[PDB]
Amino acid sequence: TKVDEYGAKDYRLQMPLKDDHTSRPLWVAPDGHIFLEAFSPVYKYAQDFLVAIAEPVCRPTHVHEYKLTAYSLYAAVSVGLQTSDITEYLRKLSKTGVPDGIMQFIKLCTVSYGKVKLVLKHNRYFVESCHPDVIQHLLQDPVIRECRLRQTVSFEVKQEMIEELQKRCIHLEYPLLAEYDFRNDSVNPDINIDLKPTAVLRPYQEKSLRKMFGNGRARSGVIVLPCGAGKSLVGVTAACTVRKRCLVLGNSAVSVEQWKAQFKMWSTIDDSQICRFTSDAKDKPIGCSVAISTYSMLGHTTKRSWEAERVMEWLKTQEWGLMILDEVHTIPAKMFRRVLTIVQAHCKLGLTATLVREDDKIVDLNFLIGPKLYEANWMELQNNGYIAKVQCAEVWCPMSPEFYREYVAIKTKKRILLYTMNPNKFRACQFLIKFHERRNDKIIVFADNVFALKEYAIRLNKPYIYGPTSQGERMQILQNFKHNPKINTIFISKVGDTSFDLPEANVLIQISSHGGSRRQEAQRLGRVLRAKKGMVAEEYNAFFYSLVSQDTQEMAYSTKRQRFLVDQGYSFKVITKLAGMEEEDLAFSTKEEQQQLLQKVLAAT
Amino acid sequence: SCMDASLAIKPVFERFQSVIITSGTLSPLDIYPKILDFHPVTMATFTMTLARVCLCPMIIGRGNDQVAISSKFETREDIAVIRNYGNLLLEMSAVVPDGIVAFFTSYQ
Amino acid sequence: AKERPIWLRESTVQG
DNA sequence: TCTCTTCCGCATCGCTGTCTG
DNA sequence: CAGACAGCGATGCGGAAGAGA
């Protein structure tokens, strides 16, 4: 609240300093931001404690950055951490005390939890609460009565209005409890699903699962994990532990296919007990319990097919023990978020790898599903070898003179097709691919602009893939890339970042970018994170290039596009010039060649 | 087959005034009077004491996979448990000097 | 072998 | 004759862009 | 600045035409 002569807020008169400050490696700002030391001998103990109560926002190598909020604190109580259980240790760990504002905030957040509990039974949602006083003063707003369908006091609530009420209670200072007591539940018989000994659970995976299962009752929340970290395995394990009906929801045809393979590979459950509620193909969804479906079909808004209609009615009627939603970052979408209310589930676990977006709808994920249970440390995984180390880089490609003139001259937005297609980046990518091609490194180019992607591919006569590409040709190209030594590069369009199972690649060039989308960058980055059989963290075998054009709008997006990655700890190095580019022969080595491309670019319209 | 050993050993205890069953590696003495019907006079366990720790026993239950390694009848067929035993012997044989004996539970 | 490229090993900025 | 497989036609989302206030 | 509509590039779904037994 107090501002120094500079921008920083003043806290000299706010909180004191512990005499043994050096022993205590923890800081506590009044705003809730916390700065831990990654060099302290007791760093690990602090890391576990802070992660339990706070959600990371920046975890560079030396000094991590944690901020706590109401959602973060509620999760701590769910795992059994009381206000004194956390504040006492926080004061002990704090090297500068705890400001009263945080103290009262912690007290208010912890006490305002568990008073209101939401339980669904017999397809009816009852807002149970041991304390009756909470309900008495909770019915002041008229929305509650109209929302409601027309000790331990409970009342049934309308199915459709659950989401509206859930967000209302969050700002009402009375969060709802979504814990599932699968251990004590006889209404829905347990499913015959078991985890085979073959599956191996990594220490972070166990910790993420442990945080989800704070007590005998499973907690509904979001577990963010890298795609190469094996987030699919964790989802399977959670379903196996619940031992009740689970409805995994994908986002595309590829997503549903992989999940079924993951279930069979890691779960002993029989093949016949798994169904694919997919329009393209089905396996008698009503017949068995464990099902894999997609947001589009379940949330499909237009006319429903007769066969789908029966399945949809069957899904609505039944009650699901678990509702795994992979790629939760798309949930707050209008159609996608409707699926939450359409189906009934006790705890709706959420998995993903890039929990970031521009529109401030990510915060809704806290109430749409639950608090962010776990968010693995990408840097720590790199040290442990679970994830391939990446030498993130940003190759600056100076714009050719003529190209800039039209780019600056025109105030229209043809520039997206212009600065994405310039000779220097073309030579840069052409040179960059050539260097990696002779190094036996697998390349995965990317480009939002299909027009640029096709032009780059034909000139480099490489197997470019994109949306309307035939499925058969899509598989044929991938198989050659994985197997054929003669080919070690595939030019994938945006479809690559959506969902796929691609072979591990040593490098990932990105000539163009869709825009300032932290999702796409992290989505595309996860492709090379696939750990190799016998690599090492320090070898930096995996690389990532995000080619950009200097003095162009592309730079603004690139800096705005790397915010999420740097927060994890990745350092994006800049490369003004590439050694050996001049000696190596490359296309567009003469003014005429650039002129024809510019004319074609201008003729694009 | 007999069922209780007290029948055949009764004359030894009865005929002789005192019998001392001195043993090494004896599992707890309390069972023996139950198995063999006799009233013991002393029940003491003697612990070897030396200026140097001659013996350093250990028990290994968790493998490199942090997986339970119990040799249960139902767990006998598990390949991973068998893999842990082989790997432990390989590493142990590498460091252990000449002379090592491994005992199993059955020929099969 | 399998050594990192020059433009990644050291800064390529003219400084 | 089914049957599968495949191909148009709707609808949706990410992100940005345009347009008049 | 700002709210509504729209573009380019991706996705899903549901209604209609070729080989093959």
* Three-state SS letters, A13-71: CCCCCCCCCCCCCECCCCCCEEEEECCCCCHHHHHHHHHHHCEEEECCCCEEEEECCHH
Per DSSP, helices labelled H in A353-468 are 364-368, 378-384, 401-409, 415-419, 423-437, 450-460
Question: Angle at the Cα of B22 (from B21 to B28), degrees rounded to 5?
Answer: 85
Closest residue in chain A to residue B68, using alpha carbons only: A197
* CA–CA gap between residue A41 and residue A38 (Å, rounded): 8
* CB contact at 8 A, A313 and A342: no
Report how far residue A501's alpha carbon sits from residue A481's, in angstroms, rounded to the nearest whole number: 13
A256 CA → E16 C1’, Å: 26
Residue A351: in which H helix or E strand, if any? strand A350-352
Residue A304 near residue A310, CB atoms below 8 Å: no
A252 touches strand E (CB under 7 A): yes
Resolution for this PDB entry, in angstroms? 4.3
Which position has the token pair 């609460």? Answer: A129
- A95-126 b/e with 16+ CB inside 10 Å = b? bbbbbeebbebbeebbebbbbbbbbbeeeebb
The runs of H, that is alpha helices, within A80-156 are 83-93, 100-111, 132-138, 142-147
- Find chain C residues with C-beta within 8 A of A393's C-beta: 7-8
Q: Are A395 and A575 in contact (CB under 8 A)?
A: yes
Q: How many CB atoms lie within 10 A of CB B99?
A: 5
CA atoms within 13 A on the CB side of A84: 0
Q: Does B91 touch chain A (CB under 8 A)?
A: no
Q: How wide is the angle at C-alpha A381 spanned by C-alphas A50 and A512, nearest 5°?
A: 110
Shortest CA distance from A391: residue in chain C: C8
Alpha-carbon dihedral A157, A159, A161, A165, rounded to 10 degrees: 50
- Could you give the maximum distance between any two Cα atoms of chain A, in Å? 85
Q: Is B12 an interface residue toward A (CB < 8 Å)?
A: no
DSSP codes, A181-240 = -TTS--SSPPP---B-TT----HHHHHHHHHHTSSSSBPP-EEE--GGGTHHHHHHHHHH
What span, in angstroms and rounded, lies between the C-alpha atoms of A397 and A576?
7
HSE (side-chain half, CA atoms, 13 Å) at A153: 8
The DSSP symbol for A106 reads H
H or E element that contains A352: strand A350-352
SS3 A457: helix
**Chain B residues 30-49 within an 8 A CB cutoff of chain A:** none
How far is A301 from A84, CA to CA, in rounded Å?
48
Q: Please say whether the beta carbons of A321 and A245 come within 8 A.
A: yes
Query: Are A382 and A545 spatial neighbours (Cβ–Cβ below 8 Å)?
Result: no
Short-list A389, A354, A61, A383, CA closest to A203: A383
Chains in touch with A (≥3 Cβ pairs < 8 A): B, C
Report the candidate in A502, A508, A489 with the shortest Cα–Cα distance to residue A565: A508
Asked if residue A220 lies in contact with residue A177, where contact means CB atoms within 8 angstroms, the answer is no
Q: Residue A519's closest CA among A361, A388, A358?
A: A358
Q: Does residue B6 contact residue B35 with C-beta atoms inside 8 Å?
A: yes
At residue A509, φ and ψ (nearest 5 deg) are -85, 150
Tell me the Ramachandran region of residue A184: left when phi exceeds 0, alpha when psi lies from -120 to 50, beta otherwise. Answer: beta
Distance separating alpha carbons of residues A582 and A236, to the nearest angstrom: 52
CB A144 within 8 A of CB A156: no
The string of DSSP letters for A292-326 reads: EEEHHHHT--SPPPHHHHHHHHHHHHS-EEE--EE
**DSSP letter (8 states) at residue A3:** B
Q: Which residues pair with A326 in a beta bridge?
A: A351
Q: Does A199 reach chain B within 8 Å, measured CB to CB?
A: no
Residue whose tokens read 């409601």: A148
Residues of C in contact with A575 (CB under 8 A): 7-8, 12
The answer to whether A386 touches A202, Cβ cutoff 8 Å, is yes
Q: Which residues pair with A492 in a beta bridge?
A: A446
Measure the CA angle with vertex A114, ends A109 and A118; round to 5°: 125
HSE-up of residue A108 (Cα within 13 Å, Cβ side): 12
Other Cβ atoms less than 10 A from the Cβ of A577: the count is: 15
For C7, the closest of A539, A540, A575 (CB atoms) is: A575
Closest CA to A324 of A340, A300, A341, A338: A340
Closest CA relative to residue A414, chosen from A422, A402, A423, A406? A406
Does the CB of C9 have a partner CB in chain A at under 8 Å?
no
| Residue A384 and residue A378 in contact, taking contact as beta carbons nearer than 8 Å | no
Is residue A511 a contact partner of residue A547, using CB atoms and an 8 Å limit?
A: yes
**Closest residue to A573, CB basis, from C2, C8, C14:** C8
**Do A208 and A75 contact (CB within 8 A), yes or no?**
no
* DSSP 8-state assignment for residue A129: B
- Type of residue numbered B12: V
**A490, burial (CB in 10 Å: exposed 0-12, middle 13-18, buried 19+):** buried
Which of A439, A540, A578 is closest, CB to CB, to C7? Answer: A578
As a whole number of angstroms, the distance between CA A393 and CA A547 comes to: 9
Helix then strand count (H, E) for chain C reads 1, 0
CA A123 centroid distance within chain: 31
Go through chain A and list every residue after which a break occurs, taking a C to next N gap over 2.5 angstroms, comma-separated.
Answer: 150
> Contact A507/A545 with Cβ under 8 angstroms?
yes
Give the helix ranges, DSSP H, for chain B: 6-15, 31-35, 79-95
> Residue A200 and residue B78: Cβ atoms within 8 Å?
no
In sign, the C-alpha dihedral spanning A277, A279, A283, A284 is positive
| Segment (H or E) for A375 | strand A372-375
Residue with tokens 């509702």: A323
Contacts with B65 from chain A: Cβ below 8 Å: 200
Cβ-Cβ contacts under 8 Å for A242 (sequence gap 6 or more): A180, A182, A218, A321, A322, A347
